[PDB]
């Protein structure tokens, strides 16, 4: 058999239904989401970190002069200072007194912390969405399995064949450009490709964690060594990675709508309850039984004892019933007013039983259906005083 419906995209609660083909006894289907992962497709543009300005030793070219060349280093800086006469330990340095020479040489590179703490700049496309469902039907125990959310791909949970999706809405918490740092992700909308602005977010952009070409823009500027002393002073804007790491906005783990955490390894968005899931289950024929051996149910009445429209199962009702034969058969309320905790009941001779339920209505109007027959419990005027509520 094959039963189709639509269920809500909510994780913790189960979705219950009664699938029934005439001639056979109904079987209770109960399928519950556990995970719901809208996983986009990401490619790593670069990883930005805090820089380090390495300074190879300055060559002091006594009497004469030493012009330099340009070199293939990131943010490399030449300039030569004139008239230094430096003073090392235990004497002066090369008394020419108009040396016309000094070589301040500074260039940017990755720091040792760059391999431990870096912010990766991912681009984002729509990608895919999947989940992991847990299903029970009839008498078979709970069985769970990862399943794609789309109309095409089926899934073998036990023996029954499952098809869910596509998701009723294409909304995703992410957007075209995101930044991953640590365990968290930020919707920083403008990672820069090869155009850094000297210390905002992108100032040392490395195409990967080990690229041998680090686009460095830090306004590295060399300065005169004053009063005749050998050192390579410089002055650059503070790190942009440090600035972003300091004054970032809130993460997307804490401002994402629809209440979803953000797993990082596939860069998922777990349990983000929005929309609906079309559902189509294919149950084995063996799961059904001939209606001859199941309890026929007639001479039925439903008295509501007491209830309250809270999230939890704040409801009790009792149905009186005149038996046909002893057995065990299911319950389900297909209406949207009430949701019933109990799945199956043992009907003995004159079996009158009770069931608990939850509702959001002041005066309910749900109709219970117990083992191939329907009884309407109008319900009483119930008082007031995380779970399933229609609330319409």
Indicate which CATH number applies to the domain containing 302.
2.60.40.350
Who contacts 4 (Cβ-Cβ below 8 Å, separation ≥6)? 278, 279, 280, 281
Range of the domain at 345: 289-376
Longest alpha-carbon distance in the chain: 120
Residue 376: name the closest of 386, 384, 366, 385 by CA.
366
Show the DSSP H helices in the chain as ranges.
Answer: 240-247
* Beta-carbon-side half-sphere exposure of residue 226 (alpha carbons within 13 Å): 3
Reading the block at residue 105, the tokens are 């040489």
CA 21, CA 120: separation in Å to the nearest integer?
54
HSE value, Cβ hemisphere, 13 Å, CA-based, for 380: 14
- Cβ count near 222 (within 10 Å): 22
Residue 356 DSSP label: E
**DSSP label at residue 244:** H
CA-nearest of 318, 301, 307 to 381 is 307
Is the distance from CB of 91 to CB of 60 less than 8 angstroms? Answer: no
Element (H, E) at 29: strand 27-48
Cα-Cα-Cα-Cα torsion 84, 88, 93, 98, nearest 10 degrees, comes to 10
Gap between the Cα atoms of 99 and 85, Å rounded: 7
What beta strand segments (E) does 140-297 contain? Answer: 140-148, 155-157, 160-164, 177-181, 184-186, 204-206, 214-216, 221-222, 234-235, 276-282
Q: What is the resolution of this structure in A?
A: 3.5
Q: What gap in Å lies between CA 272 and CA 7, rounded to an integer?
A: 15
Distance from C-alpha of 202 to C-alpha of 49, rounded to nearest angstrom: 9
């Amino acid at each position: 058999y094959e039963h189709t419906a639509v269920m809500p995209n909510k994780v913790g609660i189960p979705y219950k239904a009664l699938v029934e083909r005439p001639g056979y006894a109904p079987v209770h289907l109960q399928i519950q989401l556990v995970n719901t992962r809208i996983i986009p497709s990401t490619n790593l543009e670069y990883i930005t970190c805090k820089y380090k300005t390495k300074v190879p030793s300055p060559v002091v070219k006594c009497c004469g002069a030493t012009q330099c060349t340009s070199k293939p280093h990131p943010d490399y800086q030449c300039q030569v200072f004139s008239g230094v006469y430096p003073f090392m330990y235990g004497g002066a340095y090369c008394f020419c007194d108009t040396e016309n020479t000094q070589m301040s040489e500074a260039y940017v590179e990755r720091s040792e912390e760059c391999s431990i703490d870096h912010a990766k700049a991912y681009k984002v496309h729509t990608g895919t969405v999947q989940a992991m469902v847990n299903i029970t039907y009839g008498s078979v125990s709970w069985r769970s399995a990862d399943v794609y959310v789309n109309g095409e791909t089926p899934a073998k949970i036990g023996d029954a064949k499952l098809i869910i999706g596509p998701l009723s809405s294409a909304w995703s918490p992410f957007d075209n450009k995101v930044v991953v740092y640590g365990h968290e992700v930020y919707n920083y909308d403008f990672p820069e490709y090869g155009t850094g602005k000297a210390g905002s977010f992108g100032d040392l952009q490395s195409r990967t964690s080990t690229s041998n070409d680090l686009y460095a823009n830090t306004n590295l500027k060399l300065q005169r060594p004053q009063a005749g002393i050998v050192h390579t002073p410089f002055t650059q804007v503070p790190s942009g990675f440090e600035r972003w790491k300091k004054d970032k906005g809130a993460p997307l783990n804490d401002v994402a709508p629809f209440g979803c955490s953000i797993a990082l390894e596939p860069l998922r968005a777990e349990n983000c309850a929005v929309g609906s899931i079309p559902i189509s289950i294919d149950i084995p024929d063996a799961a059904f039984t001939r209606i001859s051996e199941t309890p026929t149910v007639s001479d039925l009445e439903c008295k509501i004892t007491e209830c309250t429209y809270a999230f939890d199962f704040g409801g009790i009702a009792t149905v009186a019933y005149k038996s046909s034969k002893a057995g065990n058969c299911p319950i389900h309320s297909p209406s949207g007013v009430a949701v019933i905790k109990e799945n199956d009941v043992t009907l003995a001779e004159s079996g009158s039983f009770t069931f608990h339920f939850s509702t959001a209505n002041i005066h309910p109007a749900f109709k219970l259906q117990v083992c191939t027959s329907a009884v309407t419990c109008k319900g009483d005027c119930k008082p007031p005083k995380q779970h399933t509520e229609s609330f319409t």
